[PDB]
């Protein structure tokens, strides 16, 4: 019996930690973000996770004001105007209130926790009256009594409306710490390093995903590779296309950071640790932290049928409109050792079969469905909607493949579709 579907069930979240770096040098952070809403609408993302953007004098709790925007970025009025323009595109806005975000310990000192908590309660009220759709809180492993504070902040948020969302982020990849936070709260999303603490094999990927769902009784969750960092900084280069397919087709809300749709990478370890500039085009002004070529830029990837940006737009469109991906069940198939394969299914809608080859060579799928719920078995063939191999994509798209003899090319991911049979 299906719960009411809230705005975050309908597709991806998109994090913008450093508004000025996202926007560039031509405008101030809040106004400038407003001019990119049309680009963000083309990605079909359902929400933006912003900031933090508040006043925070490093490690000085009494020169930190969670209710005031940093004036370099804009005014309260600019913010309110941003929220209204986003709402005309059906894009919701989450605010990151991590308090000491400019210092080393982002939650101030342990001794200071009750002062933080008093400040935070006042801030949640003020921001919820200004029209935000919810809140994000990062590095929650550095927050004392995190489960208790998160529960309390959740209750204040939900008290106004169940359409308000809370997101927590951790540096941890440890399943037992992750489960402990989730048990303390209800319908909280928790982002983490869980999916990027990996050997990046077929078997390890299967094992990570199935153990997490089993440990949480398959409740609604987020899927991410970090609480903040870029996908191309956490995941091997050969797997960027494959991991995009995975995050879009697992059951739950996928969460990305700005630039993930391009394969952007962040600062190198000799450079200052600063968020990278979003490379709108190949102009010099965008060349921090690395020089960028046309093919690493929004302008370049926008007309390329082979680009990561083109695959993001395609998958995001399908995620927002097909019921089996909106809120379908998940079943893991058995497959050869280098593969992970699974299906998504709702009622009598089109089913989806995902097959992912984690090896640099041709592999037989050997798909098995030995244990499968009444109502669903595998067909003999299925239609190919998408391959990560853009060569095959230009000449086999919308064609049909026999499942029993399915073969994958090196590092290939497949999205296949099959119908309900009466
Ligand atoms: Cl943490």
Swiss-Prot record:
Entry's family note: Belongs to the SLC3A transporter family.
Sugar attachment sites: 62, 155, 159, 197, 214, 281, 295, 405
Modifications after synthesis and translation: Phosphorylation on Ser-196 or Ser-198 and on Ser-316 by ecto-protein kinases favors heterotypic cell-cell interactions. N-glycosylated; N-glycosylation is crucial for trafficking and stability of SLC3A2 to the plasma membrane.
PTM-bearing positions, type Phosphoserine: 196, 198, 316
Keyword tags: Amino-acid transport, Cell junction, Cell membrane, Disulfide bond, Glycoprotein, Isopeptide bond, Lysosome, Membrane, Phosphoprotein, Signal-anchor, Transmembrane, Transmembrane helix, Transport, Ubl conjugation
Gene behind the chain: Slc3a2
GO molecular function list: aromatic amino acid transmembrane transporter activity; double-stranded RNA binding; exogenous protein binding; L-alanine transmembrane transporter activity; L-leucine transmembrane transporter activity; protein heterodimerization activity; protein homodimerization activity
Protein's name according to its UniProt entry: Amino acid transporter heavy chain SLC3A2
Main location: membrane
Tissues with expression: Detected on the surface of embryonic epithelial cells in the epidermis, thymus, kidney, intestine, brain choroid plexus, and in retina. Detected in adult and embryonic brain, spleen, kidney, intestine and liver, and in adult testis (at protein level). Observed in all adult tissues tested with strongest expression in kidney, small intestine, spleen, thymus and liver. Moderate expression in brain, stomach, heart, testis, lung, skin, pancreas and skeletal muscle. In brain expressed on capillary endothelia in cerebral cortex.
Extracellular face residues: 1-422
Gene ablation phenotype (knockout): Embryonically lethal between 3.5 and 9.5 dpc.
Subunit structure, interactors included: Disulfide-linked heterodimer with a non-glycosylated light chain (SLC7A5, SLC7A6, SLC7A7, SLC7A8, SLC7A10 or SLC7A11). Interacts with TLCD3A/CT120 and ICAM1. Constitutively and specifically associates with beta-1 integrins (alpha-2/beta-1, alpha-3/beta-1, alpha-5/beta-1 and alpha-6/beta-1), but minimally with alpha-4/beta-1. Interacts with LAPTM4B; recruits SLC3A2 and SLC7A5 to lysosomes to promote leucine uptake into these organelles and is required for mTORC1 activation.
One GO CC term on file: neuronal cell body
Keyword Disulfide bond carried by entry: yes
BP term (GO), one: carbohydrate metabolic process
Function, in words: Acts as a chaperone that facilitates biogenesis and trafficking of functional transporters heterodimers to the plasma membrane. Forms heterodimer with SLC7 family transporters (SLC7A5, SLC7A6, SLC7A7, SLC7A8, SLC7A10 and SLC7A11), a group of amino-acid antiporters. Heterodimers function as amino acids exchangers, the specificity of the substrate depending on the SLC7A subunit. Heterodimers SLC3A2/SLC7A6 or SLC3A2/SLC7A7 mediate the uptake of dibasic amino acids.
Induction line: Expression induced by concanavalin-A stimulation. Induced during cell activation but is subsequently maintained at constant levels throughout the cell cycle in exponentially growing cells.
Whole sequence portion shown: 105 to 526 of 526
Membrane topology note: Single-pass type II membrane protein
Cell compartment(s), UniProt: Apical cell membrane; Cell membrane; Cell junction; Lysosome membrane
Top-rank taxon, per record: Eukaryota
């Amino acid at each position: 019996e299906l719960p009411v579907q809230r705005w975050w069930h309908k597709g991806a979240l998109y994090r913008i930690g450093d508004l000025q770096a996202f926007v560039g040098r031509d405008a101030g952070g809040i106004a400038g973000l407003k001019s990119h809403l049309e680009y963000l609408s083309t990605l079909k993302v359902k929400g933006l996770v912003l900031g933090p953007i508040h006043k925070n004098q490093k490690d000085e709790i009494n020169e930190t004001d969670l209710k005031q925007i940093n004036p370099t970025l804009g005014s309260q009025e600019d913010f309110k105007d941003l929220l209204q323009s986003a709402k005309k595109k059906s894009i919701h806005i989450i605010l990151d209130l991590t308090p000491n975000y400019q210092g080393q310990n982002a939650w101030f000192l342990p001794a200071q926790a009750d002062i933080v908590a008093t400040k935070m309660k006042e801030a949640l009220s003020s921001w919820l009256q200004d029209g935000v759709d919810g809140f994000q809180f990062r590095d929650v492993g550095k927050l004392m009594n995190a489960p208790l504070y998160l529960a309390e902040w959740q209750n204040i948020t939900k008290n106004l409306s169940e359409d308000r969302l809370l997101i927590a982020g951790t540096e941890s990849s440890d399943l037992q710490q992750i489960v402990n936070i989730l048990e303390s709260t209800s319908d909280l999303l928790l982002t983490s390093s869980y999916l990027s603490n990996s050997t990046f094999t077929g078997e390890r990927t299967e094992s990570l995903v199935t153990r997490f769902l089993n440990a949480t009784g398959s409740q609604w969750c987020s899927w991410s590779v970090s609480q903040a960092g870029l996908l191309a900084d956490f995941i091997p280069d050969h797997l960027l296309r494959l991991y995009q397919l995975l995050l879009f087709t697992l059951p739950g809300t996928p969460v990305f950071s700005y630039g993930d749709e391009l394969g952007l990478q962040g600062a190198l370890p000799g450079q200052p640790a600063k968020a990278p500039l979003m490379p709108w085009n190949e102009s010099s002004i965008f060349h921090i932290p690395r020089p960028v070529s046309l093919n690493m830029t929004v302008k370049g990837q926008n007309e390329d049928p082979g680009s990561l940006l083109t695959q993001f737009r395609r998958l995001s469109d399908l995620r927002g409109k097909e019921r089996s991906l909106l809120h379908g069940d998940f079943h893991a198939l058995s497959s050869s050792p280098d593969l992970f394969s699974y299906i998504r299914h709702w009622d009598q809608n089109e089913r989806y079969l995902v097959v992912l080859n984690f090896r640099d060579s041709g592999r037989s799928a050997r798909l098995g469905a030995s244990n499968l719920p009444a109502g669903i078995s595998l067909p003999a063939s299925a239609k190919l909607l998408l391959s990560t191999d853009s060569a095959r994509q230009s000449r086999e798209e919308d064609t049909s493949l026999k499942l029993e003899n399915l073969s994958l090319n090196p590092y290939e991911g497949l999205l296949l579709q099959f119908p309900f049979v009466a």
